[PDB]
Design a protein around this ligand. Structure first.
Ligand SMILES: C[C@H](c1cnn(C)c1)n1cc(C(F)(F)F)cc(-c2cccc([C@]3(c4nncn4C)C[C@@H](C)C3)c2)c1=O
Ligand code: NA
Ligand SMILES: [Zn+2]
Ligand SMILES: [Zn+2]
Length: 384
């Protein structure tokens, strides 16, 4: 339950973003001017919020804006993420100045979130005006699914989204659902907006086999680099410059919904291409046949992707989840947050799953089977 996004609440988020910008302006951070660049994103987020307030220019327009379901979630999420970034610097202390620390890794996770939030608000409020009900999902087959299960909703909880997705494309496990949440819930707010749904379905189209496409292109493909920057992708392929056909593919934080495929040419150069509005596996199979994409990340083995034209381990889902912000979510159900701690082992889950386990005569802890000596209610943050 979020509070009304009135002017006072929007202004609180500006002040919090201003503290995050100042913390990030510290030269001891040695912060790269490379995407997602939080020092450009936060001022741009403030300017978009100003543009929205300029369109809802009277008390009755402001009232309509304050109770808009998506806007309430957006303002509440912006506030929480800004507060989280402030907390990260506070606890991180000197670890924020070490480029390889978990604290700095968490700042990168927040910078990605702020970038995705900015792209989302610009798509949902283009030119400051709410167009969530008139938002056009790019792929028609994906759009039909959204309309079937969610009607004209601009945003739905992850819990509801995942249950409805499972009706069409089966999710085989709790770790698979956790990996999928970190892929679709780009804003890390436990909701799926029509914009996040559009991004996911563009990236892993065609809809008819979307989870198979995602599992094989992102979860287990050696060429997949997530939002790794262009400079890092070029530097990574530089070690394979004498092996033409070595290639990697990445998601672009400035061009959400598009892939960029970097590759080594016959003359040792590293070039890139942005495939059109088509399946990434199609561009990869075509490129394999024409001799352009042969060695994913320089590896001799290029996975056969032709199966997608007409098996993932729990360990593979676990490693994929590291980059996400899902540590606070119960691993058994992947739909409720962890709210109970088992003693003495210390494992965490939601009470609903612990109750189901206890009522099944499950021996000890569901994870380690150690005797449950007691429990304690707890609240978990993704960075614990
Ligand atoms: C590599 C790239 C990057 C960005 N800047 N730099 C220098 C490197 N990166 C780095 C981080 C981290 F942890 F903060 F470092 C987190 C992500 C990241 C965060 C959330 C979701 C994901 C996806 C993902 N891809 N593989 C696993 N996940 C979970 C891609 C999305 C659709 C789901 C990636 C990421 O992409
Ligand atoms: Na989200
Ligand atoms: Zn649970
Ligand atoms: Zn345990």
């Amino acid at each position: 339950k979020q509070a009304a996004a009135d002017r006072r609440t929007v202004e609180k988020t500006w002040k919090l973003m201003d503290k995050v910008v100042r913390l990030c302006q510290n030269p001891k951070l040695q912060l790269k001017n490379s995407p997602p660049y939080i020092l450009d994103i936060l001022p741009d987020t403030y300017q978009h919020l100003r543009l929205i307030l300029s369109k809802y220019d009277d008390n009755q327009k402001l009232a309509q804006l304050s109770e808009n379901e998506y806007f309430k979630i957006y303002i509440d999420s912006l506030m929480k993420k800004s507060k989280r970034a402030i907390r990260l610097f506070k606890e991180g202390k000197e670890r924020m100045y070490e480029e390889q620390s978990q604290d700095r890794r968490n700042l990168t996770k927040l910078s990605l979130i702020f970038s995705h939030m900015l792209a989302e608000i610009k798509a949902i409020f283009p030119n400051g005006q709410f167009q969530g009900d008139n938002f056009r999902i790019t792929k028609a087959d994906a759009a039909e699914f959204w309309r079937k299960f969610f009607g004209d909703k601009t945003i739905v909880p992850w819990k509801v989204f995942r249950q409805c997705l499972h009706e069409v494309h089966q999710i085989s496990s709790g770790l698979e659902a956790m990996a999928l949440k970190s892929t679709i819930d780009l804003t890390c707010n436990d909701y799926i907006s029509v914009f996040e749904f559009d991004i996911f379905t563009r990236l892993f189209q065609p809809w008819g086999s979307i989870l198979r496409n995602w599992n094989f292109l992102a979860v287990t493909h050696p060429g997949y680099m997530a939002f790794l920057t262009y400079d890092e992708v070029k530097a990574r392929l530089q070690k394979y410059s004498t092996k033409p056909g070595s290639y990697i593919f990445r998601l672009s934080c400035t061009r959400l919904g598009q892939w960029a495929i970097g590759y080594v040419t016959g003359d040792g150069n590293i070039l890139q291409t942005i495939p059109h509005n088509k399946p990434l596996f199609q561009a990869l199979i075509d490129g394999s046949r024409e001799g352009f994409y042969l060695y994913p990340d320089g590896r001799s083995y290029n996975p056969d992707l032709t199966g997608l034209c007409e098996k993932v381990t729990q360990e593979q889902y676990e490693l994929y989840c590291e980059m996400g912000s899902t540590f606070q979510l119960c691993k058994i159900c992947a739909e409720n947050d962890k709210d109970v701690k088992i003693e003495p082992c210390g494992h965490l889950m939601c009470t609903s799953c612990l109750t189901a386990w206890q009522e099944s005569d499950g021996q000890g802890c569901p994870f380690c089977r150690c005797e449950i000596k007691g429990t304690e209610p707890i609240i978990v943050d993704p960075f614990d």
